[PDB]
Design a protein around this nucleic acid. Sequence first.
RNA 1: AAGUGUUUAAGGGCGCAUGGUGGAUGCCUUGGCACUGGGAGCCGAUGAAGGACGUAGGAGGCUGCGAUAAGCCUCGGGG
Length: 64
Amino acid sequence: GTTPGELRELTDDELKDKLRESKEELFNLRFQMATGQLSNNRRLRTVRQEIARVYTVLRERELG
RNA sequence: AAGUGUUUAAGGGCGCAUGGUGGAUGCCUUGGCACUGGGAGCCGAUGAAGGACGUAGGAGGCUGCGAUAAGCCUCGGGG
Ligand SMILES: [Mg+2]
Ligand SMILES: [Mg+2]
Ligand SMILES: [Mg+2]
Ligand SMILES: [Mg+2]
């Protein structure tokens, strides 16, 4: 839900915070999907792609 | 009285009319076969060729991808 653009003003530690918050979110809605009370399915994909985006930006910061 | 003499179809044959089965024939094609002209002529410890297992909101196969998993970023195209 957040463009990779506005992830470049965030430092390493707060990018890491964003990433762990997102991983916790993903665990929660994975449980909700398993128990049957998640109707919105595209939420899983968006959060999974957000995690991938956060790693991508971190690696780009490391290398250049 | 003597004599003559049609009609049987359990079933079978042949001809026709009507169907079934079967998948030939005709007419085709998301497939191939033989070449022509170019390109590129190597990939691999910066882990190859090729695979295993996984991966989509729902079971499998083919495809794509690899725990960042039908995808992630940047630059162009286009709509
Ligand atoms: Mg008869
Ligand atoms: Mg050589
Ligand atoms: Mg597969
Ligand atoms: Mg573009």
